[PDB]
Design a protein around this ligand. Structure first.
Ligand SMILES: [K+]
Ligand SMILES: [K+]
Ligand code: NA
Lengths: 422, 422
């Protein structure tokens, strides 16, 4: 029964193309939510999103992380794969794990997911086939669209020949991927795992879909950076975002033996279902409560021990209130000083990438002893009874962190990380 | 480590709407491959598929497995979800596991997947939005398209509130789902798991996709039942199919304590990556060989002990030969009498549902002491040195079965099942 540590981080987010720029911006209270410009939004009620920089000079480019020979093939893939490969490349390079022997490669697996996957690829390819009406699509269409080709391409890139798998659980995806990858190492099936989520869901049919589900904030289109306001009384839905978050997990002795960087230990994983509704959260938050609770029981810790909670915290009316009541039920009496914040206040809701991106932020809170802010928390809902780190980052003692993710289908995942020295 | 048994089976396949009809037809040498009629194939080079019966009288209907009040909501979902819910409903009812109590519901999880998921839903919805250009899609679009809403809806139907997860690994999906579900029970995180795969990939953009990848047989459109011919010299690509295969897995004592029917014990699981190519299988079969080898090591058995192998066996030129050479390398010296067959010879390639459907066939081969035929094996390739059960089913002693699934991204899964009598 093996201990599992975090030895590499990778990020592509609406506030940075790597971990260092993203985290500086999160901590400084910078928002990455912007006006959509790449397609016509004149008929869409929501006109904003958390978007990856694509300026000529500083923007996201395949060449920044891909050798000249591999650019062509990568460019044929859906953007979720671009983002995923870029985050994984950063994580792998950060970890120093570049095995060149068979055993080490065979003991390296991957669990990389997306909630929706190759949405733009399928949308564009479908429309184009309808237009040309010649029965012909690109030879690259299938692999470009498949959720598992993110794991495929990272595997190919580094020769990782262990389990080649995914998690796909809507807005919980990135968390399940990391939890499942931890379990794989815990039980001895792999020594190193590349894990997380990636998403590129900001397309015409994607935004229209979430608008039709009434999930999105549609009333701050003139002031995009004010839209995502978890637990604020003017909240009225989430803001979609895009990007990826990938980590290297590693068996603890293995990491120590090669001199790896060690950010923290993954000690608890809760995974539950609401069993209630396709899109609406359990009215009593039963699934969310149980995931948090089980994560801590799995860790053999008590709720007083948590210092900081990175919430799911999407800026929905129902969801934020249900999460807040579940958290307060679990933590208020035993840990009235606990901090909780939503970084979706800054970058929006990256859907299947949310959980992994936020797992990374959680690890960085431990590294830097700082809780990132809930931006836009100007008028907190009445039920609030804990510190939600409104507006500005707060330096504090952070030894244990809980991170939550919930998704459509009632699927819930919670992860507990601990600092090494405590 | 808990022992894990199979206590329920569910099938929707091109040769039957349930397990009994499907299995009778498989054994009897019936083919479910037919001409595509639901959409215009005049510009598609492949015009055939393994298709679920949809006649007025005997065809697939939601009503057959869905209470009147739930039909409307289910009908908004993609067909992969319809097929998945149908197979899971059969499996759950077959197992008798219909807990009313909270503890039991909380210990019941799901790992239900698809390779491509809601392809028709995304394709249709994208085209229709492009046409209407009014910023509006159905409110049901997002959940109807999400892979994890199969697990979501089955969870809701039965109140199963344990882990609510998926596996998504292209053509290996159904095998990884079952293997992961077994591991979940093995290590104590659940007592019962609903697991498998579902796929509805036969759409205009789906077929065009696989044609463009040069994956499909395009030479037997006038004789559909002859197209899928694994290891036959005239093979020239796979035939796409649709359906689902779902099982109930259960911790052994738990099953015994409630008097469950027990089909077999899942004893081995291998999961590997080729790390070679997006779509082409490793030319030396390294990933496939290792998955088989590891599945047997994981089972603590030796290769002489396997009686029957349900191959991946898709009817491709390279793939069939690679699998054959890997199988013969592993088995020929120690087990020259081993039987191997591909049931894709009858129903085609159900992509993400293939592995779970074939896992079910594997269990039934044990139940009925019969190996299903490789149809169309008229002129075996020269390399063949084992019994491929050409043309007609063969009764024999079957106590241990190996089942393989390989997919794009170089992902490989092998499962070993044994008779519970030993
Ligand atoms: K979180
Ligand atoms: K098989
Ligand atoms: Na034998």
């Amino acid at each position: 029964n093996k201990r599992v540590v975090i030895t590499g981080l990778g990020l592509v987010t609406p506030v940075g193309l790597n971990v260092n720029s993203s985290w500086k911006n999160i901590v400084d209270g910078v928002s990455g939510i912007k006006t959509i410009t790449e397609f016509d939004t004149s008929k869409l009620a929501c006109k904003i999103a958390g978007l990856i920089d694509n300026s000529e000079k500083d923007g996201f480019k395949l060449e920044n992380f891909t050798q000249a020979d591999d650019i062509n093939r990568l460019s044929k893939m859906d953007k979720f794969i671009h983002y995923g490969v870029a985050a994984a490349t950063e994580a792998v390079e950060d970890s120093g794990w570049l095995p060149d022997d068979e055993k080490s490669r065979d003991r390296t697996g991957l669990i990389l997911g997306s909630g929706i996957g190759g949405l733009k690829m399928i949308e564009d390819t479908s429309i184009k086939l309808y237009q040309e009406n010649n029965g012909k699509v690109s030879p690259f269409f299938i692999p470009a669209s498949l959720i598992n080709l993110l794991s495929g391409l990272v595997s190919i890139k580094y020769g990782f020949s262990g389990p080649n798998q995914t998690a796909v659980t809507a807005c919980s995806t990135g968390a399940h991927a990391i939890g499942d990858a931890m379990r794989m190492i815990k039980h001895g099936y792999a020594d190193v795992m590349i894990a997380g989520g990636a998403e590129a869901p900001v397309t015409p049919v994607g935004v229209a879909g979430f608008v039709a589900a009434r999930a999105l904030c549609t009333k701050y289109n003139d002031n995009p950076k004010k839209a995502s306001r978890p637990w604020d009384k003017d909240r009225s839905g989430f803001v979609m975002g895009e990007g990826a978050g990938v980590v290297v997990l590693e068996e603890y002795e293995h990491a120590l033996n090669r001199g790896a960087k060690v950010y923290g230990e993954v000690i608890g994983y809760g995974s539950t279902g609401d069993a209630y509704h396709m899109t609406a959260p359990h009215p009593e938050g039963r699934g969310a409560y149980r995931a948090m609770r089980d994560a801590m029981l799995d860790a053999t810790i008590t709720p007083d021990m948590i210092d900081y909670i990175n919430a799911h915290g999407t800026s929905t009316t129902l969801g934020d209130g249900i999460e807040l009541a579940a958290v307060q039920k679990l933590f208020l009496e035993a840990n009235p000083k606990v901090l909780m914040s939503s970084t979706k206040s800054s970058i929006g809701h990256l859907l299947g990438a949310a959980g992994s991106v936020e797992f990374i932020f959680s690890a960085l809170a431990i590294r830097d002893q700082i809780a990132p802010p809930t931006l836009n928390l100007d008028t907190p809902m009445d039920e609030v009874n804990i510190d939600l780190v409104a507006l500005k980052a707060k330096k504090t003692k952070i030894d244990y962190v809980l991170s939550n993710s919930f998704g459509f289908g009632g699927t819930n995942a919670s992860l507990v990380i601990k600092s090494i020295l405590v």
